Design a protein around this nucleic acid. Structure first.
Length: 1353
DNA sequence: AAGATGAGACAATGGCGATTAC
RNA sequence: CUACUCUGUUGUUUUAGAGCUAGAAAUAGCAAGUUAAAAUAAGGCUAGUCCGUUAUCAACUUGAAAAAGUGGCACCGAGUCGGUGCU
DNA sequence: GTAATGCCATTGTCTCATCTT
């Protein structure tokens, strides 16, 4: 029995269906295991696996690095105590011991409750003498007297524990720290990036402006006032606003559609910066980097207020001044409030719940919340000067430990540490002996390229050891093989090219890469002069001349500079027109101009012998960021340069990686031509092929070379094949599940492999079209928006959007369209639906009658093209229409549609562009087909067909097999079935087109033979598959062309070459409808142990509740607080006995106990001991059942539940709504947006109106389903009541809201939903009792093989 | 008319506590 | 398009920073607050300045584990699958 | 006393209304 499998792979579901030769879904009897009376069940071979999305490893990575940081910080403190130990033992015996046990309460604390001195008197004296640690630090830096060793340790430990950032390398100096130098660097980067209309800031006094004590916005405005050519909303103004701490919007600066806001203080700035940079290119990356540096400088000046130089510790003195000012402002505030506003004093200083001062100090109230709370209070009170100016300047009652301290470099803390060590050096000899040791503890930082200092038991570590001793900050240089460690780092961090494995990818800023992309963008440029009247691609000599003369002289090349300074200057061409590019060249030779600015030797940059040297330099600067390792890897080229520019070269840094390798760009060579990819880009004769075309085109050896190396890089296991794929972990999980589903399906069919496996990979728009309309209108100059104003909400209508796209004019006739008579007007297709199924705006026009297109079934005639070509050219250059639409509109002037165009349409409909789909097909093909013959040829028994979603979607829309995702989860399985049907139909109808869809080595049939010329009526003497280029015409009974003639096709479609019936237009559509109507579809929720964090991360205060979880073994949460809300890994049905407490009373209980993630290892180590520790006795070990999340139970009347938890359930049933209601809902909800022909649209609308009683019937279906299964009668009553409340509303709205009503009945967790204004809150199933007497159903991945256990026992 | 800030609603399911009802 | 290394600042939690005056308390009037220690997934053995939140996971049999095995075919129907013949 | 009906969480984010430029 031959069969085929259809698959719909997604990130949260995998649809699957099995079809026969007559497009039927088999129904089979499957054995049922367990201990019930049901031994067989009938199931349809169609279903869908559902599963939670796979997660990325980012969060785990962050947590891991955080753990490492905490560990290493604690180790730093342990090092400091190790240095201090013997002399602290001589001074105080239990000092460090008291410091470690500071957290414990006095009952559990073995030593005195007072940490530092152990007696209350000395503690009071210390705190009064030093109320903050910065007081002690400033004293120890500015006092020559001998100090107590405990206080010295406190200062050093505070400076080491919170040591500051490492963003600045080397000693602190004005070149990389003062605001002025970084401002000059910012305007230098700005002028370098533009140079046309640059900003000159020679006169500015950046220090006096940026460091001045004023509000942020007023400082920004004051700096803008000093630059008359720039404004606050300019790019530079937005950069300064970003550097000062404001939230500037860069949307207007780059005309981006979506608003991109950046805030340096926000933790999510980097990925936001990566999104923005992705939109505008990485040329601005270093610009924003300089802004960040400038921000830190400004921040450092905001903290380093005490610049008077009378002290040696600027930071500690500044914190003292902040303390004093805080004290003054506090006492003044209390005085003013008590004087003027006696009432509400308690709300500010005692209440603490509403963000008062007590909330600012003792409650969870941030600085911005406290300021926001006290701003109106200060405004209302009198005598509040000198506090509001501080509040607006964000310097009122500041704490010493705030979010600003991230900007403090570690060289300052190092300075204060050096000062303290030097002051107390002679008094304590071991400080003199261990000065460099302590300094090394503060300054030592494990390099990125060394990584975890493991000894073989770390999956993430790679470093090499030159000894066998504990790595410390002092012996790191002589124990860590930095050379070998850096080499391993290189070997690990080098990703391999997806096109060619086993070859390292070049850096993104490599010179050869920039040359490659520059030529790749330049080769798609076409020029038309005055006389030739036809587009001609640039020749090799032209490319070399333009590159050498223009691209090697300026960073930005625009079309105007290109035509003015090359074509007119050298080629003497007065007027040129360019279609390939829009405004400028996206590619650029950034690295070239960077190196030119560094070494200032233009001839050296163009010598082809020095290419490898420059590639080595860029690679070294890309891989590493540390100055020492860069100097080590750049020492070989010290003699080449003058050693002045070498310093500037070492300061340059590059980040990023490309996607292609050197061997692909300029390595592999065509055997016949003898030219590499780059050589083909530079020279290719008349026609110039781009990169993607060389990969696609089979006439060259490049495609063969890329294909033949794909299987070398692969591995042996399935896991390695899945890990090598290029996709998110979610789709990789879905792919693995798909493979397993295929394995089970071929097992179910008696180990018979299928014949075919068909695979499918499962307000902004209004803004884009609005910006498009506004730019087109502003460019043209017709003020249609003035006489007929519209908003982005109304622009969703097709006919109105087309009305505004066409300047309010008819496309075929020279007359204006009537704004308020669009119902009489028709929407025409530039390329008819009989040739290509393209219903986008790119191929649609609006006109009063589609008879104006003319009599031909092709593109519009030449008589209309000749009349309207000028107006279409004005709409073209005004960006109202695209280049392709203009090409299609004016195709009759060039003969009309051609065989190459029809072949392009066929390839557009039949080939899948996504690489991930091809790799999945490769995996399935390799796993399914594994036989050979005597020779070395692969026998392909199973064909893996790759299909596009558009085909099945159009199949649904054309024949009313409508999809409504909100009804149930059946649509995945249905999509898989329809994929199988369409795939099998296409492989049966057109076997010679196997190379388009089927994976593997096939004959590359040129499509020119297949396309029939001059309507040969698909003759049989010659092949002639089709005259009309639409592949899905044979499913249709009639074919309506663009003129109105209705062509007829036979009732039974058969293959021409083999005489096999491929589609019976009666029996097969009836079969498809019957399959779509089946109510039993196997929907399976993949059961999964829950993993991840133990609980909510919140560390809650102490409470009298046994739900609290201890943060450490001996930290009783009733005294110390802790975590609550643990996640249940899985539930465990246990049959056991418990003590009632009134007596022994071993009542035999049966209940689900949730094993939390934290408890899992202990429970699995020894379950019985764990359960006895929980209180259970005489546990029936053999009856314990492991129940992971989504475990399925069936109760009475087919009602089903899924396990969400140990104490909560989810809905387990699917609502098999009849097909007629699904189609009615789709039609009623899509009333205005039918997007079909007018007659067809009228038919659908009349069908909806004639069948409006289906609304009440659907409500009845939801009601009866809910009463049987859902059991939420309060919500059902709410629903029915709301439906009766809104029966007056239009049919469309009632349909749209019934769609929301199906959330009441959906499989999975209950969720709230809205019926018009009314909201129905979720009813949860917060009890697991009933499942203890239900039937548990263990399911295979396909759900076919079941095991039913009656838990009554 | 555009940009920024504040408030009311959405994500999105399960655990905790309170509540209420038998 | 994933994956990875180095690093910081906040935050939270207990304890320390003596509260003072009345009053049998309850509760009232005021003073004060900015800082610090320690933990920051419980923990693990392999004892490293390492690892612990990703991937993977129905049931049953054999195994410490990677992993191997276990479930008849047609026909008439179709409310979550039912019925009939052969085997 | 036991068993079935709103807030919080890595407290993010999006849209609408009002005020300011």
């Amino acid at each position: 029995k031959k069969y085929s499998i259809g698959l719909d792979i997604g990130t949260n579901s995998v649809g699957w269906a099995v079809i026969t030769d007559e497009y039927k879904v088999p129904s089979k009897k499957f054995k049922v295991l367990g201990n019930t009376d049901r031994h067989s069940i009938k199931k349809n071979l169609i279903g869908a696996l559902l599963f939670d999305s796979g997660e990325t490893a980012e969060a785990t990575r962050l947590k891991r690095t955080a753990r490492r940081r905490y560990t290493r910080r604690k180790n730093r403190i342990c090092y400091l105590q190790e240095i201090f130990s013997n002399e602290m033992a001589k001074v105080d015996d239990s000092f460090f011991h008291r410091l470690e046990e500071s957290f414990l309460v006095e009952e559990d604390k073995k030593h005195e409750r007072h940490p530092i001195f152990g007696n209350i008197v000395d503690e009071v004296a210390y705190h009064e003498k030093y109320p903050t640690i910065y007081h002690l630090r400033k004293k120890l830096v500015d006092s020559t007297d001998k100090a107590d060793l405990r206080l010295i340790y406190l200062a050093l430990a505070h400076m080491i524990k919170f040591r500051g950032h490492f963003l600045i390398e080397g000693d602190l100096n004005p070149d990389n720290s003062d605001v002025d130098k970084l401002f000059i660097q910012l305007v230098q980067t700005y002028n370098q990036l533009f140079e046309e209309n640059p900003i000159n800031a020679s006169g500015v006094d950046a220090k006096a402006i940026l460091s001045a004590r004023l509000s942020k916005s007023r400082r920004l405005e004051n700096l803008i006032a000093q630059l008359p050519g720039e404004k606050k909303n300019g790019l530079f103004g937005n950069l300064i606003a970003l550097s000062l701490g404001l939230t500037p919007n860069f949307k207007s600066n780059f005309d981006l559609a979506e608003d991109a806001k950046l805030q340096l203080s926000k933790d999510t700035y980097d990925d936001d910066l990566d999104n923005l940079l992705a939109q505008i290119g990485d040329q601005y990356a270093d610009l924003f980097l300089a802004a960040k540096n400038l921000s830190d400088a400004i921040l450092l000046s905001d903290i380093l207020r005490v610049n008077t130089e009378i002290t040696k510790a600027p930071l500690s003195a500044s914190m003292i001044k902040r303390y004093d000012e805080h004290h003054q402002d506090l006492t003044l505030l209390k005085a003013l409030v008590r004087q003027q506003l006696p009432e509400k004093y308690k709300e500010i200083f005692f209440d603490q719940s509403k963000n008062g001062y007590a909330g600012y100090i003792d409650g969870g109230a941030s600085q911005e919340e406290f300021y926001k709370f006290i701003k109106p209070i200060l405004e209302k009170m009198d005598g509040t000067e000198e506090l509001l100016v501080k509040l607006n300047r964000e310097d009122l009652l500041r704490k010493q430990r705030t979010f600003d301290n991230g900007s403090i470099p570690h060289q300052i803390h190092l300075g204060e540490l050096h000062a303290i060590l030097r002051r107390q050096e002679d008094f304590y000899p071991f400080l003199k002996d261990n000065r460099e040791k302590i300094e090394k503890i503060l300054t030592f930082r494990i390099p990125y390229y060394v990584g975890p200092l493991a000894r073989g038991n770390s999956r993430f570590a790679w470093m090499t050891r030159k000894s066998e001793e504990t790595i410390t900050p002092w012996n790191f240089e002589e124990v860590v093989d930095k050379g070998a460690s850096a080499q391993s780092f290189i070997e690990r961090m080098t990703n391999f090219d997806k096109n060619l494995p086993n070859e390292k990818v070049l850096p993104k800023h490599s010179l050869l890469y920039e040359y490659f992309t520059v030529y790749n963008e330049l080769t798609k440029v076409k020029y038309v002069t005055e006389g030739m009247r036809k587009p001609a691609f640039l020749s090799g000599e032209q490319k070399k001349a333009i590159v050498d003369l223009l691209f090697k002289t300026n960073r930005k090349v625009t079309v105007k500079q290109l035509k003015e300074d090359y074509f007119k200057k050298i080629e003497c061409f007065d007027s040129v027109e360019i279609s390939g590019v829009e405004d400028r060249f996206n590619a650029s030779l950034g690295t070239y101009h960077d190196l030119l600015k560094i070494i200032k030797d233009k001839d050296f940059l163009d010598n082809e012998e020095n290419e490898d040297i420059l590639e080595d330099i860029v690679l070294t600067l890309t891989l590493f960021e540390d100055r020492e390792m860069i100097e080590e890897r750049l020492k070989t080229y010290a003699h080449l340069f003058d050693d002045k520019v070498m310093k500037q070269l070492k300061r340059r840094r590059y980040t990023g990686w490309g996607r292609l390798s050197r061997k692909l760009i300029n390595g592999i060579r065509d055997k016949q031509s003898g030219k590499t990819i780059l050589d083909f880009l530079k020279s290719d004769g008349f026609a110039n092929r781009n990169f993607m075309q060389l990969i696609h085109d089979d006439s060259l050896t490049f495609k063969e070379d890329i294909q033949k190396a794909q299987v070398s890089g692969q591995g042996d296991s399935l896991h390695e094949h899945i890990a090598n794929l290029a996709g998110s972990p979610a789709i990789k999980k879905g792919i693995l599940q798909t493979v397993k589903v295929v394995d089970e399906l071929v097992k179910v069919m008696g180990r018979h492999k299928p014949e075919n496996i068909v695979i499918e990979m499962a307000q902004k728009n209004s803004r884009e079209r609005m910006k498009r309309i506004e730019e087109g209108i502003k460019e043209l100059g017709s003020q249609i928006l003035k006489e007929h104003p519209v908003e982005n909400t109304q622009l969703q209508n097709e006919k109105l959007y087309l009305y505004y796209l066409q300047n309010g004019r008819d496309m075929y006739v020279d007359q204006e369209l009537d704004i308020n008579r669009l119902s009489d007007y028709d929407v025409d297709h530039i390329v008819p639906q009989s040739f290509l199924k393209d219903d986008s705006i790119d191929n649609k026009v609006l006109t009063r009658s589609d008879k104006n297109r003319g009599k031909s079934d092709n593109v519009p005639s030449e008589e209309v093209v000749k009349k309207m070509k000028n107006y279409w050219r004005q709409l073209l250059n005004a960006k109202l229409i695209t280049q392709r639409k203009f090409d299609n509109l004016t195709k009759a002037e060039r003969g009309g549609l051609s065989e190459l165009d029809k072949a392009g349409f066929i390839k557009r409909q039949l080939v899948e562009t996504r690489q991930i789909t091809k790799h999945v097909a490769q995996i399935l093909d390799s796993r399914m087909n594994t036989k050979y013959d005597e020779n070395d040829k692969l026998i392909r028994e199973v064909k893996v067909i790759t299909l596009k979603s558009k085909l099945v979607s159009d199949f649904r829309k054309d024949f009313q097999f409508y999809k409504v995702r909100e009804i149930n989860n059946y649509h995945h399985a249905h999509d898989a079935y329809l994929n199988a049907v369409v795939g099998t139909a296409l492989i049966k109808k057109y076997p010679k087109l196997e190379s388009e869809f089927v994976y593997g080595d096939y004959k590359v049939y040129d499509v020119r033979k297949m396309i029939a010329k001059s309507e040969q009526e698909i003759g049989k003497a010659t092949a002639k598959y089709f005259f009309y280029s639409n592949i899905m015409n044979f499913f249709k009974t009639e074919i309506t062309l663009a003129n109105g003639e209705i062509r007829k096709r036979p009732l039974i479609e058969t293959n021409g070459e083999t005489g096999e019936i491929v589609w019976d237009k009666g029996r097969d559509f009836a079969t498809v409808r019957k399959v779509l109507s089946m109510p039993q579809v196997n929907i399976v929720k993949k059961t999964e142990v829950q993993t991840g964090g133990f609980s909510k991360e919140s560390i809650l205060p102490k409470r009298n509740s046994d739900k609290l979880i201890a943060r450490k073994k001996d930290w009783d949460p009733k005294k110390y607080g802790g975590f609550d809300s643990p996640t249940v890994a899985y539930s465990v049905l246990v049959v056991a006995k418990v003590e009632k407490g009134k007596s022994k009373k071993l009542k035999s209980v049966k209940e689900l106990l949730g094993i939390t993630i934290m408890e899992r290892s202990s429970f699995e180590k020894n379950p019985i001991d764990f359960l006895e520790a929980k209180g259970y006795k005489e546990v029936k070990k053999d009856l314990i059942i492991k129940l992971p999340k989504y475990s399925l139970f069936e109760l009475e009347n087919g009602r089903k539940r899924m396990l969400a938890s140990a104490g909560e359930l989810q809905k387990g049933n699917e609502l098999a709504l009849p097909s007629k209601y699904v189609n009615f809902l789709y039609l009623a909800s899509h009333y205005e947006k039918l997007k079909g022909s007018p007659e067809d649209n009228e038919q659908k609308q009349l069908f909806v109106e004639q069948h409006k009683h289906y609304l009440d019937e659907i409500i009845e279906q939801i009601s009866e389903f809910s009463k049987r299964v859902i059991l939420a009668d309060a919500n059902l009553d709410k629903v029915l009541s709301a439906y009766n409340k809104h029966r007056d509303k239009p049919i469309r709205e009632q349909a749209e809201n019934i769609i929301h009503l199906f959330t009441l009945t959906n499989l999975g967790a209950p969720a709230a939903f809205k019926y018009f204004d009314t909201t129905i809150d979720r009813k949860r199933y917060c009890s697991t009792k009933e499942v203890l007497d239900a039937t548990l159903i263990h399911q295979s991945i396909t759900g076919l093989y079941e095991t039913r256990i009656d838990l009554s026992q």
